[PDB]
Write an enzyme that holds these catalytic residues in place. Structure first.
Site, PDB file in Angstrom:
ATOM      1  N   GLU A   1       0.793  -1.224   0.000  1.00  0.00           N
ATOM      2  CA  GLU A   1       0.000   0.000   0.000  1.00  0.00           C
ATOM      3  C   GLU A   1       0.827   1.277   0.000  1.00  0.00           C
ATOM      4  O   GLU A   1       1.866   1.365   0.657  1.00  0.00           O
ATOM      5  CB  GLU A   1      -0.942   0.017   1.208  1.00  0.00           C
ATOM      6  CG  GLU A   1      -0.232   0.001   2.551  1.00  0.00           C
ATOM      7  CD  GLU A   1      -1.159   0.323   3.712  1.00  0.00           C
ATOM      8  OE1 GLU A   1      -2.155  -0.403   3.908  1.00  0.00           O
ATOM      9  OE2 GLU A   1      -0.885   1.308   4.431  1.00  0.00           O
TER      10      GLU A   1
ATOM     11  N   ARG B   1      -3.347  10.930   6.708  1.00  0.00           N
ATOM     12  CA  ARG B   1      -3.101  10.219   5.460  1.00  0.00           C
ATOM     13  C   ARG B   1      -4.318  10.227   4.543  1.00  0.00           C
ATOM     14  O   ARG B   1      -4.216   9.871   3.372  1.00  0.00           O
ATOM     15  CB  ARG B   1      -2.718   8.763   5.730  1.00  0.00           C
ATOM     16  CG  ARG B   1      -1.446   8.546   6.527  1.00  0.00           C
ATOM     17  CD  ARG B   1      -1.124   7.057   6.553  1.00  0.00           C
ATOM     18  NE  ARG B   1      -0.980   6.528   5.199  1.00  0.00           N
ATOM     19  CZ  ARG B   1      -1.111   5.248   4.866  1.00  0.00           C
ATOM     20  NH1 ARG B   1      -1.394   4.335   5.785  1.00  0.00           N
ATOM     21  NH2 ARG B   1      -0.955   4.879   3.603  1.00  0.00           N
TER      22      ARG B   1
ATOM     23  N   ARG C   1      -5.627   5.731  -1.404  1.00  0.00           N
ATOM     24  CA  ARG C   1      -4.439   4.891  -1.467  1.00  0.00           C
ATOM     25  C   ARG C   1      -4.339   4.144  -2.786  1.00  0.00           C
ATOM     26  O   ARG C   1      -5.304   4.035  -3.541  1.00  0.00           O
ATOM     27  CB  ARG C   1      -4.475   3.834  -0.357  1.00  0.00           C
ATOM     28  CG  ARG C   1      -4.806   4.346   1.030  1.00  0.00           C
ATOM     29  CD  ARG C   1      -3.567   4.505   1.877  1.00  0.00           C
ATOM     30  NE  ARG C   1      -3.914   4.827   3.259  1.00  0.00           N
ATOM     31  CZ  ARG C   1      -4.440   5.985   3.648  1.00  0.00           C
ATOM     32  NH1 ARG C   1      -4.678   6.940   2.760  1.00  0.00           N
ATOM     33  NH2 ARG C   1      -4.737   6.183   4.928  1.00  0.00           N
TER      34      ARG C   1
ATOM     35  N   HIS D   1     -10.987   4.619   1.838  1.00  0.00           N
ATOM     36  CA  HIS D   1     -10.272   3.904   2.884  1.00  0.00           C
ATOM     37  C   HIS D   1     -10.432   2.378   2.855  1.00  0.00           C
ATOM     38  O   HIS D   1     -10.941   1.783   3.805  1.00  0.00           O
ATOM     39  CB  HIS D   1     -10.715   4.456   4.246  1.00  0.00           C
ATOM     40  CG  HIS D   1      -9.713   4.259   5.338  1.00  0.00           C
ATOM     41  ND1 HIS D   1      -9.488   3.036   5.933  1.00  0.00           N
ATOM     42  CD2 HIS D   1      -8.867   5.130   5.936  1.00  0.00           C
ATOM     43  CE1 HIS D   1      -8.545   3.164   6.851  1.00  0.00           C
ATOM     44  NE2 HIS D   1      -8.152   4.424   6.871  1.00  0.00           N
TER      45      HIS D   1
END
Length: 96
Positions: free
Chosen positions: A54, A65, A69, A85
């Protein structure tokens, strides 16, 4: 399950930045970028531990963050984008 494919050009510009850092093997903004992704909920295809990793996709103005991702798969050109998420994933198509 994977939620289809999505062109890289249709994702936030930060997604492109993240893929460029992955191509150069870093350096990354977070020392944790690059850690193994477990795919604990089996949303992505089943693979051995270490097949997935990741990386952060920076969210403008976020102190944390964020929820974006990119999960790399060891296969060539296999990358997944998540904007919620790890809830859902889309296969990133770098050719468009």
């Amino acid at each position: 399950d994977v939620s289809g494919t999505v062109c890289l050009s249709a994702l936030p510009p930060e997604a492109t930045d993240t893929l460029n850092l992955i191509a150069s093997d870093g350096p990354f903004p977070y020392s944790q970028d690059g850690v193994t992704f477990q795919n604990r909920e089996s949303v992505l295809p089943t693979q051995s531990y270490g097949y997935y990793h990741e990386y952060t996709v920076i969210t403008p103005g976020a102190r944390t963050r964020g929820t974006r991702r990119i999960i790399t798969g060891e296969a060539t050109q296999e990358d997944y984008y998540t904007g919620d998420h790890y809830a859902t994933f889309s296969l990133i198509d770098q050719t468009c």
